[PDB]
Scaffold this active site. Structure first.
Site, mmCIF file in Angstrom:
data_model
loop_
_atom_site.group_PDB
_atom_site.id
_atom_site.type_symbol
_atom_site.label_atom_id
_atom_site.label_comp_id
_atom_site.label_asym_id
_atom_site.label_seq_id
_atom_site.Cartn_x
_atom_site.Cartn_y
_atom_site.Cartn_z
ATOM 1 N N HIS A 48 0.809 -1.220 0.000
ATOM 2 C CA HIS A 48 0.000 0.000 0.000
ATOM 3 C C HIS A 48 0.840 1.267 0.000
ATOM 4 O O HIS A 48 0.399 2.303 -0.489
ATOM 5 C CB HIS A 48 -1.009 -0.001 1.147
ATOM 6 N N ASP A 49 2.049 1.195 0.537
ATOM 7 C CA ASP A 49 2.914 2.363 0.539
ATOM 8 C C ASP A 49 3.493 2.640 -0.839
ATOM 9 O O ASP A 49 3.515 3.802 -1.277
ATOM 10 C CB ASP A 49 4.086 2.220 1.506
ATOM 11 N N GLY A 67 5.576 6.922 -4.460
ATOM 12 C CA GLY A 67 5.923 5.517 -4.336
ATOM 13 C C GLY A 67 6.288 5.064 -2.939
ATOM 14 O O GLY A 67 5.606 5.430 -1.961
ATOM 15 N N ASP A 69 7.976 5.872 -0.529
ATOM 16 C CA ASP A 69 8.524 6.965 0.255
ATOM 17 C C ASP A 69 8.197 6.968 1.745
ATOM 18 O O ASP A 69 8.550 7.908 2.453
ATOM 19 C CB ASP A 69 8.085 8.298 -0.377
ATOM 20 N N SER A 71 5.336 7.288 2.947
ATOM 21 C CA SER A 71 4.228 8.231 3.127
ATOM 22 C C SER A 71 3.066 7.695 3.943
ATOM 23 O O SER A 71 2.328 8.465 4.549
ATOM 24 C CB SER A 71 3.708 8.744 1.783
ATOM 25 N N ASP A 194 -4.720 -19.442 2.276
ATOM 26 C CA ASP A 194 -4.217 -20.741 1.813
ATOM 27 C C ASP A 194 -4.056 -21.617 3.045
ATOM 28 O O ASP A 194 -4.122 -21.106 4.156
ATOM 29 C CB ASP A 194 -2.970 -20.649 0.894
ATOM 30 N N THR A 196 -1.558 -22.826 4.473
ATOM 31 C CA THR A 196 -0.336 -22.584 5.231
ATOM 32 C C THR A 196 -0.007 -21.081 5.367
ATOM 33 O O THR A 196 0.875 -20.563 4.663
ATOM 34 C CB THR A 196 0.832 -23.306 4.543
ATOM 35 N N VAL A 199 3.691 -20.296 6.008
ATOM 36 C CA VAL A 199 4.681 -20.894 5.116
ATOM 37 C C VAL A 199 4.570 -20.257 3.733
ATOM 38 O O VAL A 199 3.500 -20.270 3.093
ATOM 39 C CB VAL A 199 4.503 -22.449 4.981
#
Ligand code: HEM
Ligand SMILES: *[C@@H]1O[C@H](CO)[C@@H](O)[C@H](O)[C@H]1NC(C)=O
Ligand SMILES: *[C@@H]1O[C@H](CO)[C@@H](O)[C@H](O)[C@@H]1O
Ligand SMILES: [Ca+2]
Ligand SMILES: [Ca+2]
Ligand SMILES: [Mg+2]
Length: 336
Positions: A48-49, A67, A69, A71, A194, A196, A199
């Site tokens: 998400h950052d 991007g 950064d 933020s 999933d 696992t 893992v």
């Protein structure tokens, strides 16, 4: 190479500070080098950052986002208000204090925490770690993060704009092999994606391809589809990506080899780690990251299901030969 105060060798003096950060994150943030919720959350945060980057917005005469950064931490007041950023407050706050107390940038910290967090999960590759991202940033524009109800076209569109091809979108999604959901259907809090959740393996790719037959919760929540067995949650976007013509083959090729999945994901992650930056300006501190323990289990179709239960969606190659586990159907416990 240089030898840091604590005695650890490294290729660059700017890597020394990270050994202290490593010690801190493992002890406290990871509560003893564990692969539980904290790692999965950090994995949500790093994605998400970084994805808050958009050349097309820039083209429309707007700020496209900086991007990776940091933020999401620096401007958590704005970003954590984003629909896609629910359930991340306590994690952002914990990381804020680490970056502050060590004098490292938020951008670098998030990337470091991801590599370190993953080392605590068996099967994980050794992610690359570059350092040197500025600590200043502007808040990310809203709506740059793909959501679970988005159409495949919309998802590939958003990711493509950021610089990822469809193959890379599938590669990045390996992170769902260490995942659960808490906000799509609260009735089944922390139901794994999933079998696992601790893992890093190919089970995610295999299981999302099995026919959906079960409703794990009292009701089917927003963007939820039927899963192959009790306790497992199937997100709508994962389900569609697994079967769509534009991504099906990459998805299928990710089922039989843990090694190949790791390599691809690692490469995709290295590309995502520098969104908004020029890697030639950063310093390589990859040698600081510890190795994760090995995962020797073979990829398997679980609970007595066979290849006849796999909804093959790739036309150019046969579904690979993998192991089959005996029945009965499993029932997944909530992720820790
Ligand atoms: C097509 C893009 C993606 C979509 C639409 C998507 C969506 C989601 C959603 C809605 C959740 C459930 C969160 C919750 O309710 O608690 C989730 C969980 C998760 N996602 Fe994604 N995701 C995507 C890509 C990725 C990528 C590329 C990463 C990071 C490399 C990632 C890492 C995680 C992790 C580890 C979790 C588990 C969080 C936890 O267990 O607390 N996902 N994802
Ligand atoms: C990074 O910025 C935050 C404010 O957004 C500040 O509190 C922090 O101390 C800064 N860190 C460094 C290492 O300059
Ligand atoms: C499968 O059984 C597990 C416990 O073994 C539950 O977590 C799940 O909801 C389903 O009943
Ligand atoms: Ca950002
Ligand atoms: Ca897994
Ligand atoms: Mg059958």
């Amino acid at each position: 190479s240089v030898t840091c105060p604590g005695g650890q060798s490294t290729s660059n003096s700017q890597c020394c500070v990270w050994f202290d950060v490593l010690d801190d994150l493992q002890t406290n943030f990871y509560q003893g080098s564990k692969c539980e919720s904290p790692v999965r959350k950090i994995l949500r945060i790093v994605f998400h950052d970084a994805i808050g980057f958009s050349p097309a917005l820039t083209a429309a005469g707007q700020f496209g986002g900086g991007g990776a950064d940091g933020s999401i931490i620096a401007h958590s007041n704005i970003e954590l208000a984003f629909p896609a950023n629910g359930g991340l407050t306590d994690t952002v706050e914990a990381l804020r204090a680490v970056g502050i107390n060590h004098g490292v940038s938020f951008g670098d910290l998030i990337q470091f925490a991801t590599a370190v967090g993953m080392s605590n999960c068996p099967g994980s590759p050794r992610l690359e770690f570059l350092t040197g991202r500025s600590n200043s940033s502007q808040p990310s524009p809203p709506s740059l993060i793909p959501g679970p109800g988005n159409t495949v076209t919309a998802i590939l569109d958003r990711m493509g704009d950021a610089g990822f091809s469809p193959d890379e979108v599938v590669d990045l999604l390996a992170a769902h092999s260490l995942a659960s959901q808490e906000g799509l259907n609260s009735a089944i809090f922390r139901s794994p994606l999933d079998s696992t959740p601790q893992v890093f393996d190919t089970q995610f790719y295999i299981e999302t391809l099995l026919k959906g037959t079960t409703q794990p919760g009292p009701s089917l929540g927003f963007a939820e589809e039927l899963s192959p067995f009790p306790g497992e949650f199937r997100m709508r976007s994962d389900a569609l990506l697994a079967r769509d013509s534009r991504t099906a083959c990459r998805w299928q090729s990710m089922t039989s080899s843990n090694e190949v999945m790791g390599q691809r994901y690692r490469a995709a992650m290295a590309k995502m780690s520098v969104l908004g930056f020029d890697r030639n300006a950063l310093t390589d501190c990859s040698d600081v990251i510890p190795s994760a323990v090995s995962n020797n289990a073979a990829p398997v179709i679980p609970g007595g299901l066979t290849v006849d239960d796999i909804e093959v969606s790739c036309p150019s190659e046969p579904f690979p030969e993998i192991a089959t586990a005996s029945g009965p159907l499993p029932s997944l416990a909530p992720a820790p």
